[PDB]
């Protein structure tokens, strides 16, 4: 099949900026490349086809270039409506393949996350399960690492995290990580902690509590 490679995976910019996204094909596809824009929870929208043919209705600031194996999508003067994820797709032959997308976000200064840890409530313990929650609030960039530790021992496989979309007011992100343990395991250890690693922190920040205070 034809493998499509998009870069960068994430692009940070500001209104007014001129930005460029690239897409490479593992083999020549002539001018048979299309570009789509997609916003959270919405269906993709066609912007460009045949490499440089602008879809009727799409703003002039969007322009495409390329042929063969190298293509680019350019936005001459980024507007707020342009922050979204973009995908390229070769329409040369089946199977039709897509690049893995480029998320165009709003750039702001690096902000360390404010970290908070929440022990499971006594009420939930009656259900036989315990949920320990770690909140990373209002940070930037989005990349962050949360590590759970029980009695100084690293956890693995028993946690899931969720992240909000970039805040429309402060351009930050927030993330919640939840460690799930049986009531038995929970009442077997004392120290519960979530260690957070982020660009804005010179060293990992650890928030914790001892079961039963």
């Amino acid at each position: 099949d034809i493998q499509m490679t998009q870069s960068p995976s994430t692009l940070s910019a500001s209104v007014g900026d001129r930005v460029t996204i690239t897409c490479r094909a593992s083999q020549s596809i002539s001018n048979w490349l299309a570009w789509y824009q997609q916003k959270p929870g919405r269906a993709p929208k066609l912007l460009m086809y045949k490499a440089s043919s602008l879809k009727s209705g799409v703003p002039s600031r969007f322009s495409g270039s390329g042929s063969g194996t190298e293509f680019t999508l350019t936005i001459s003067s980024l507007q707020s409506d342009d922050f979204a994820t973009y995908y390229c797709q070769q329409h040369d032959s089946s199977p039709y393949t897509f690049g893995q997308g480029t998320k165009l976000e709003i750039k702001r200064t690096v902000a360390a996350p404010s970290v908070f840890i929440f022990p499971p409530s006594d009420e939930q313990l009656k259900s036989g399960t315990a949920s320990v929650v770690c909140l990373l609030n209002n940070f930037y960039p989005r990349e962050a690492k949360v590590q759970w530790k029980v009695d100084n021992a690293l956890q693995s496989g028993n946690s899931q995290e969720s992240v909000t979309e970039q805040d429309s007011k402060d351009s930050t992100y927030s993330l919640s990580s939840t460690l799930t343990l049986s009531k038995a395991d929970y009442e077997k250890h004392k120290l519960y902690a979530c260690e957070v690693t982020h660009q804005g922190l010179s060293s990992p920040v650890t928030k914790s509590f001892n079961r039963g205070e």
Binding site: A43, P44, L46, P95, F116, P120, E123, E161, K207, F209
Partner: protein
């Protein structure tokens, strides 16, 4: 009047099959190339296959061959995508898309897109959530700011709404995207940061509504 109309969202048990429809009653049906593009939560777009109506010429992606059948019905100007032997990994939004219908070449990029059909694969059935407090405390008080919240656990299916103090508190509130747990039940948390000086004088309540199960819960969150 040229649009792709998709069937509504669905909830499916593992092992079952689902058949999503996409109606394109505008223009000539044979000039469409009804393709199906899947998008799993947090993943990119994935082509599944497509078909040219009337001519009934189909093309399939290797990964779905054997499990998917794409068809078209001229009488109703509707195309279908049937995915069988559903698994948890199959959970995703399925889009139908097609080049704009020419009127009498046909390139396979997608002018038109259906709004998408979400198919959720879970062994679970409808169920209201349990709401537990995420209480403020020492390790929950960064300087003069405190964080508190509600853990809306084990409900099905989506969606669930959350408000604070019946909508009187919206500032600093973050309600995270739900996560499908290993159990096939959803879970999500809603947090809010407030002045730590207000914990002894202000009441904090999260209002959770789960229409699917007609469940309503108001949980007052207080420091432990």
């Amino acid at each position: 009047e040229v649009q792709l109309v998709q069937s509504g969202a669905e909830v499916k048990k593992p092992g079952s099959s689902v058949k999503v429809s996409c109606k394109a009653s505008g223009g000539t049906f044979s000039n469409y190339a009804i393709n199906w593009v899947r998008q799993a939560p947090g993943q990119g777009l994935e082509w599944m296959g497509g078909i040219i109506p009337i001519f009934n010429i189909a093309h399939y992606a290797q990964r779905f061959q054997g499990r998917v059948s794409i068809t078209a019905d001229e009488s109703t100007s509707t195309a279908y995508m049937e995915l069988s032997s559903l698994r948890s990994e199959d959970t995703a939004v399925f889009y139908c898309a097609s080049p704009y219908p020419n009127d009498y070449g046909m390139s396979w990029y997608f002018d038109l897109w259906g709004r998408g059909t979400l198919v959720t694969v879970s062994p679970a059935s409808t169920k209201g959530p349990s709401v537990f407090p995420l209480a403020p405390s020492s390790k929950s008080t960064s300087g003069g700011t405190a964080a508190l919240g509600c853990l809306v656990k084990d409900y099905f299916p989506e969606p669930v709404t959350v408000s604070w103090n019946s909508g009187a508190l919206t500032s600093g509130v973050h309600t995270f995207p739900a996560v499908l747990q290993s159990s096939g039940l959803y879970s999500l948390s809603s947090v809010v940061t407030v002045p730590s000086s207000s914990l002894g004088t202000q009441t904090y309540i999260c209002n959770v509504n789960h229409k699917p199960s007609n469940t309503k819960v108001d949980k007052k969150v207080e420091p432990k």
